[PDB]
Design a protein around this nucleic acid. Sequence first.
DNA 1: AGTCCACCGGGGGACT
DNA 2: AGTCCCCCGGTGGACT
Lengths: 333, 336
Amino acid sequence: PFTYSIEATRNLATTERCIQDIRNAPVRNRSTQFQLAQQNMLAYTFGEVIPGFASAGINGMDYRDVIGRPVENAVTEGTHFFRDDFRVDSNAKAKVAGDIFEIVSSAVMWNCAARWNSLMVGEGWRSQPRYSRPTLSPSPRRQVAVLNLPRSFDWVSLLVPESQEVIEEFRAGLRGLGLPTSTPDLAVVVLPEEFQNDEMWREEIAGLTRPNQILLSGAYQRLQGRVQPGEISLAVAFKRSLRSDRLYQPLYEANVMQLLLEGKLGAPKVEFEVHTLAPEGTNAFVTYEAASLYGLAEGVHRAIRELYVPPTAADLARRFFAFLNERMELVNG
Amino acid sequence: PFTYSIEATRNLATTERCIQDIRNAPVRNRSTQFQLAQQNMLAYTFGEVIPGFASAGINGMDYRDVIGRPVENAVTEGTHFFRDDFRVDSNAKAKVAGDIFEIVSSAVMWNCAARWNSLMVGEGWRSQPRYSRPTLSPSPRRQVAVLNLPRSFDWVSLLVPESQEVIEEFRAGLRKDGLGLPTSTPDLAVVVLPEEFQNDEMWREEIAGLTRPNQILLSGAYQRLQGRVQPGEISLAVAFKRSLRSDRLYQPLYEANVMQLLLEGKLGAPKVEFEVHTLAPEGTNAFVTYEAASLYGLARSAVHRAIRELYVPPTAADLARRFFAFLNERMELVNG
DNA sequence: AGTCCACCGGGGGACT
DNA sequence: AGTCCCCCGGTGGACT
Ligand SMILES: [Ca+2]
Ligand SMILES: [Ca+2]
Ligand SMILES: [Ca+2]
C-alpha cells in the first residue's frame, strides 16, 4: 500500500516483490545485482490509490513525496530481506522515478478524462473528491482520451490515413535527408465518434494494479489511425527534474509537430507542455519561451506553451480540468 | 603520464593529485567523498601527449581506450592512496569521461589547425606524424581558429557587432509578443581566422600535451575572437557526446536549427555545417535521427540537413585526417 | 536470448 | 560560500 506494511510485503509472492535478487541470474554486460521492479512498485504503492482521487491527505500531499514513495517502499523491502548486501545504483532509481512520474501523472489525467467524459455524456459531475464543476456545455463530442504513449512510438500513427498521407506528399519531395517524428510522453486527443458511446472512457480506475497499468498504457492502440489533426488537444512531456541539456527533446518535437500539423495540415496552435517537479536552473522557463521555428517562416506563437511545476496531485487535476473546460470550447456540440 | 607511473604519481604535489579526498570537506548537499580532479587528470595522462600527434601507437589506438585512460589512471591512484576506502560514483566517472572527450578531441583539432595554418601561411606541411598534404591552394586568408566553447556560452557573441544587431532587432520583435529565440552553444566552433590575427603565431603552433597552461590556452581562445567573426565565417560547429541515448540527441539538433535560422535565414550566410561526434551510437537510430531537414528553410530555399553527419572516430588519427580533409574541401569559397 | 528505448541524478569546474 | 552549467552511464521493460 501507499504506507509501507511489513504484513503486505511478507504476503507478496516472490514474483510480486518490489526488489528482485538477480545476483545468481545476471544480465549480459551488466553488474546489476538487485533490480527495482517498477511495475510491482506501482502495484504495491498505488495498487489502491490514484493521487488526486483518494484521501484529502494524499491529494494535497507534496507531489514530490507522492512520486518518491515507491522507491522508498522498495528500499525498505530490500533492507528487510538483504540486510548487508542490498545495493542499488542511483541510476536504477533515476530510471524508475522518471517512469513512475510519467505513469502516475498519466493515471491522474486518465481519471480526469473519465470524470470529464462522464459529465460530457449526461451522467453527473462526480464529487469524490470535490473539484470545480466545469461550466462548459456538455456534449458527447467534447469527450477526450488520455494516451500514455509508449517508448518507441511515432505520433503520426494517431492521425487518420488521409492525414498520414498529406505528411508524405510533402515528405516524399524531400529525400540522404528526411524529417522523422518521435513522441510526446502523453497526448490528449478528442474522442473519435466511433468510440463516443463506449464506456471504458468514463470509468475512473481505483489504482495502478498491473491490469490497470496495462489498460492505461495500451489505450493508444485503440486510437491509432482514428484522430484528426486539430483533434490532438495537448501534448505533455514529463521530466521529473530538469537539467539544461535535458530540455531539448520536447522543444524539438513540439516544433516538428507544429510544422506538420499547423503548416502542412492546417490545425490550430498545437498546445505542448512540460511537467517537472525540480526545475533548478530557471534558465528552463526562459528556454521554453522559444518561438515556434516554423511560424517565423509564415507571417506567431510559442513552441512550448508552459513549463508547469505541480505542487500536489490535486493541483494536476485542477489545471487539466481548467484546460479541458477552456480548450474543448473550441469543439462544436 | 599516458600509462600510469607510481613515480610520476609520487612527485605530484597534493593539489595536483588525480583524486581529491573531500571526506572531511564535504560539499553542501553532497555526499561525494573523493572528487575526480579532471584538469589534474588531463595533465597527468595527456600532459605530454596529444593523440594523433604522438606515438604511432597512441595515434592508432582505439579512441575509446585513449579517452577512457584518464579515469583508469585516476582509479589506480585512488586504489593506491585509499585502498578499500576509495569509492567514486558512476555519475562522477560519466561527467568527467564526457568533458575529457570534448577537451581531448578539441586539442586534436587545435593541433590540426596549427599544422594547417602553417601550410596556409607559406611555412611547411610538418611531416610527423605523416598526414596526407592538403591540395588546396595556400593563403593566409584561409587560416582557421579552433574554439572550445565554454559552459553557458552564447555563440552569437562570436559574431561582429553589425550582425548581433540584426539578431537583436529580430528578437526585439519577438519580445513584443512575449516570445524569445534564445541561443546557446555548440561545444566547439571552427571559425575562419580574422585578418587582424592572420599574422599571429599562436594559431600556427601545435601544443605538446594538455598541461594546465595549454588547457587554458585552448579553452580561453574564444575570448580572443569574440565580436570578430562574420556569419559566413562560422564554418564548422561540433557537438561531442561520448555515447548516445535516444533522448540525448536533441540539443545539437535543436541548436543547429536555431543556428541555421539565424545565420542562413536572417544574415544570408551559407549552409551552416554542424556535426556530432560520438564513440558509442548503440545502433542506427541516431543516424536516421540526424537526417532531419533543417526546419526554417522548409517553410523558398535549398533544403539541407540540420546536422551534416554523425561521425564515429575509431582512432585519433582518423579524427585528424577527417578534419584535414574537411578543411581542404570547405575552405575553397574563401578567396585567397 | 539479444537488442532497443529513453528514464534522470551525482557530478567538476566557472563564476560570484 | 553559493549558484549554475552541461556532462553521461546504468538502468526496467517491450519486443523479437
Ligand atoms: Ca519524458
Ligand atoms: Ca552509481
Ligand atoms: Ca557535448
